[PDB]
Scaffold this active site. Structure first.
Site, PDB file in Angstrom:
ATOM      1  N   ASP A   1       0.661  -1.271  -0.183  1.00 17.67           N
ATOM      2  CA  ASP A   1       0.049  -0.078   0.153  1.00 17.67           C
ATOM      3  C   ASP A   1       0.929   1.535  -0.043  1.00 17.67           C
ATOM      4  O   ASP A   1       0.452   2.219   0.871  1.00 17.67           O
ATOM      5  CB  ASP A   1      -0.999  -0.182   1.243  1.00 17.67           C
ATOM      6  CG  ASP A   1      -1.988   1.035   1.076  1.00 17.67           C
ATOM      7  OD1 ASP A   1      -2.147   1.713  -0.028  1.00 17.67           O
ATOM      8  OD2 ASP A   1      -2.672   1.153   2.132  1.00 17.67           O
TER       9      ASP A   1
ATOM     10  N   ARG B   1      -0.795   8.754   1.690  1.00 17.87           N
ATOM     11  CA  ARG B   1      -1.526   8.891   3.068  1.00 17.87           C
ATOM     12  C   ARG B   1      -0.552   8.064   4.050  1.00 17.87           C
ATOM     13  O   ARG B   1      -0.577   8.032   5.205  1.00 17.87           O
ATOM     14  CB  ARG B   1      -2.701   8.145   2.975  1.00 17.87           C
ATOM     15  CG  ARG B   1      -2.932   6.881   2.465  1.00 17.87           C
ATOM     16  CD  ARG B   1      -4.359   6.113   2.505  1.00 17.87           C
ATOM     17  NE  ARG B   1      -4.253   4.926   1.785  1.00 17.87           N
ATOM     18  CZ  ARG B   1      -4.303   4.910   0.556  1.00 17.87           C
ATOM     19  NH1 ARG B   1      -4.414   6.048  -0.308  1.00 17.87           N
ATOM     20  NH2 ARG B   1      -4.400   3.758  -0.086  1.00 17.87           N
ATOM     21  N   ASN B   2       0.278   7.105   3.357  1.00 17.87           N
ATOM     22  CA  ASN B   2       1.157   6.336   4.392  1.00 17.87           C
ATOM     23  C   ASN B   2       2.594   6.712   4.539  1.00 17.87           C
ATOM     24  O   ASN B   2       3.354   6.033   5.292  1.00 17.87           O
ATOM     25  CB  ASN B   2       0.855   4.923   3.691  1.00 17.87           C
ATOM     26  CG  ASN B   2      -0.199   4.144   4.009  1.00 17.87           C
ATOM     27  OD1 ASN B   2      -0.981   4.675   5.060  1.00 17.87           O
ATOM     28  ND2 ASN B   2      -0.731   3.235   2.869  1.00 17.87           N
TER      29      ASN B   2
ATOM     30  N   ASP C   1       3.269   3.816   7.785  1.00 20.55           N
ATOM     31  CA  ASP C   1       2.384   2.711   7.967  1.00 20.55           C
ATOM     32  C   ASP C   1       2.663   1.686   7.200  1.00 20.55           C
ATOM     33  O   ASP C   1       2.756   1.543   5.842  1.00 20.55           O
ATOM     34  CB  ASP C   1       0.986   3.460   7.472  1.00 20.55           C
ATOM     35  CG  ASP C   1      -0.158   2.650   7.872  1.00 20.55           C
ATOM     36  OD1 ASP C   1      -0.505   1.628   7.313  1.00 20.55           O
ATOM     37  OD2 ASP C   1      -0.982   3.247   8.717  1.00 20.55           O
TER      38      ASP C   1
END
Length: 292
Positions: free
Chosen positions: A147, A151-152, A168
């Site tokens: 992923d 956002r991570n 993340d």
């Protein structure tokens, strides 16, 4: 205590650095499942908490996240300072990333009439390089992130000396051991959502989408398209247009990351080389970003 294996080494809960609860102070909230605080151990940290109201599986998930992050050793992956698992609520202590997540940063730091020089092409290329370096480390250690997305990723600070890091690892944790609607469809290559096949070439595709996120300054991928519309679009050969004002050499890296056959996509060594070359090119870095 569950086992975790990374780079052929097995670690256990026992291997986590347990920090005495009395040495930990929470300062302020910073923000899914659980909270994040700024804390002090004085060492400034981010504190991720496990809700006391949680299932046994949530507990194992939290434990596995701690194991995964603690075993990485790279400057572009957030450090784990330690854990506090022997008191409730349980804590994971992380490197404090004062710049926040990359998506929010891009959206908040877009050039505007008030901040006409808030960001330049070189800032974006440095973020891209940073994350690609982290991805290369994962790839050479045979870890598939699954992923890679803005956002991570996290930033050490808002200002110039900022360093971007992968922050993340929840998806990889889940897979290591959720639902269709929660899968990061817009970041996934054709063979992933179809056959459920994942390799490091999976991360190459996602990195291409991250690059688009970065150079669009924080837009959602595939504007106006739903998850299923993207799935059918990408499966049929469709690819995103260049972000506004995106230099050709940068867009070319994206389109290479999005090759339909995984064997045709570059590994991260090659991606890094291409990012470096863009960074050297005056015509690339002297390109002005759009002003909102």
């Amino acid at each position: 205590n569950p086992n975790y294996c990374f780079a052929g080494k097995t670690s256990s809960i026992s291997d986590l650095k347990e920090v005495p609860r009395k040495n930990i102070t929470l300062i302020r909230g910073l923000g899914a499942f659980g909270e994040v605080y700024e804390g002090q151990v004085p060492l400034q940290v981010a504190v991720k908490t496990l809700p006391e109201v949680c299932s046994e599986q949530d507990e194992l998930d939290f434990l596995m996240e701690a194991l995964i992050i603690s075993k990485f050793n790279h400057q572009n992956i957030v450090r784990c300072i330690g854990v506090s698992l022997q008191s409730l609520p349980r804590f994971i202590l992380l490197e404090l990333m004062a710049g926040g997540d990359l998506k929010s940063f891009l959206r908040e730091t877009r050039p505007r009439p008030s901040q006409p020089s808030s960001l330049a092409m070189l800032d974006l290329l440095h973020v891209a390089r940073d994350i690609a370096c982290g991805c290369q480390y994962l790839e050479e250690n045979h870890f598939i992130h699954r992923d890679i997305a803005a956002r991570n990723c996290l930033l050490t600070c808002p200002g110039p000396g900022r360093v971007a890091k992968i922050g993340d690892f929840g998806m990889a944790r889940d897979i290591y051991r959720g639902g269709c609607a929660m899968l990061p469809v817009k970041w996934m290559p054709p063979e992933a959502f179809m056959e459920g096949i994942f390799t490091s070439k999976t991360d190459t595709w996602s990195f291409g989408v991250l690059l688009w996120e970065i150079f669009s300054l924080g837009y959602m991928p595939y504007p106006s398209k739903s998850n299923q519309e993207v799935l059918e679009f990408v499966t049929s050969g469709g690819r995103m247009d260049p972000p506004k004002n995106c230099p050709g050499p940068v867009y070319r890296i994206m389109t290479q990351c999005w090759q339909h056959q995984p064997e045709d996509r570059p590994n991260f060594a090659i991606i890094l080389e291409r990012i470096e070359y863009c960074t050297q090119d005056p015509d690339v870095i002297n390109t002005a970003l759009p002003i909102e």
